Every structure is written in structure tokens, then in C-alpha cells.
């Protein structure tokens, strides 16, 4: 009798998708990047970027 927005009503979200509660609890929208020291940009990329 009434279409309810699942993005506003959490119960419709849990009805249509049981994994939404697990997503919210485990915070899978806030996953940090993999650890490790990032290697620096090669020089030739920089001379190519700043070449007139």
C-alpha cells in the first residue's frame, strides 16, 4: 500500500539485504589501504610532466 525507501528505512534495507547489518557493524565502507612504504614517483615521469 505504500512504497518505503530502503535507504531511509533500515527495516526495508534489512528485508531486501540481510548483509547490510554486517556491513554496518564491520565498517566495510571505511576499509583502510594496505600497509607498506609507497615507492616514490620516477624522475622521468616528472620531466615528462613538466616538459614544455
Amino acid at each position: 500500500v505504500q512504497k518505503k525507501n530502503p535507504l531511509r528505512n533500515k527495516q526495508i534495507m534489512l528485508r531486501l539485504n540481510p548483509y547490510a547489518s554486517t556491513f554496518a557493524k564491520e565498517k566495510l565502507g571505511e576499509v583502510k589501504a594496505e600497509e607498506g612504504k609507497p615507492p616514490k614517483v620516477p624522475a622521468s615521469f616528472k620531466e615528462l610532466l613538466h616538459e614544455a
Binding site: 622521468s44 615528462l48 616538459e51 614544455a52
Partner: protein, 129 residues
């Protein structure tokens, strides 16, 4: 070339005789032969008027008529469809029988070591000098 009734032909009026052509609409059109003459041929053409097709008939000299290759691809595709289907039944492996539209290109890597890019300006400096 001796043309026959039912053959599908293309109309191309060769030469620069476009100064006094009565009907330039049928140049580059494709039609079906219904009448054959020693130096003439009868061609059925269809014209589109709004939502319906009207049927026209023209008499074209043989010098402006070439056989069309409209059904060549269809007959050819029927042939290799039959042959590869027989081959697939022989070897017991599935094979594609449907031609597909062009798909977008995938990811790939372009090397720079021997192909250093050239910087271009909106005009060439060799032309400036």
C-alpha cells in the same frame, strides 16, 4: 553481362553527363530486375513517402547497371554457419554462430622506452618559420 529477371542490381550512371539528367534520384540506388532488353533493363525501385513506400519503375541502360552484392554476405554466412556447426558436432565442442557488435577495448599497457612522446603545439613551429 546478360541480366535476368529477379536479379538485384545497382545503378551507377558513369560519366559527367549530369548536365541534363531527368532523374538523378535513382543514381546509387539498388533495385530488382523485371524486364530485360538488349541495351536496356527494367528496375523496380521503392521510394519512401512519409510512413509508406511507393513503388517506381525505371528503364536503365546496361552500361549504368552492375550486379549487386547484397545477399553475398548472407549466403556466405549461411555457408560457414553450416560448416562450423558440422565441425562442432564432429568435435563435440560449442562454437559461436552469432555475429556480435564491437565491444569496448580492455585495459592494456603502453611502453615508453623507445616511443617517447612528442610535445605538440596548436601550430607547427616549422610552419611559423
Amino acid at each position: 553481362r546478360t541480366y535476368r529477371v529477379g536479379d538485384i542490381v545497382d545503378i551507377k550512371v558513369n560519366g559527367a553527363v549530369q548536365k541534363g539528367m531527368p532523374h538523378k534520384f535513382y543514381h546509387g540506388k539498388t533495385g530488382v530486375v523485371y524486364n530485360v532488353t538488349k541495351s536496356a533493363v527494367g528496375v523496380i525501385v521503392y521510394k519512401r513517402v512519409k510512413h509508406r513506400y511507393i513503388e517506381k519503375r525505371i528503364n536503365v541502360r546496361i552500361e549504368h547497371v552492375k550486379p549487386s552484392r547484397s545477399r553475398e554476405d548472407f549466403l556466405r554466412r549461411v555457408k560457414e554457419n553450416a560448416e562450423l556447426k558440422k565441425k562442432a558436432k564432429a568435435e563435440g565442442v560449442p562454437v559461436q554462430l552469432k555475429r556480435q557488435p564491437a565491444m569496448p577495448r580492455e585495459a592494456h599497457t603502453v611502453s615508453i622506452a623507445d616511443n617517447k612522446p612528442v610535445t605538440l603545439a596548436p601550430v607547427a613551429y616549422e610552419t611559423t618559420i
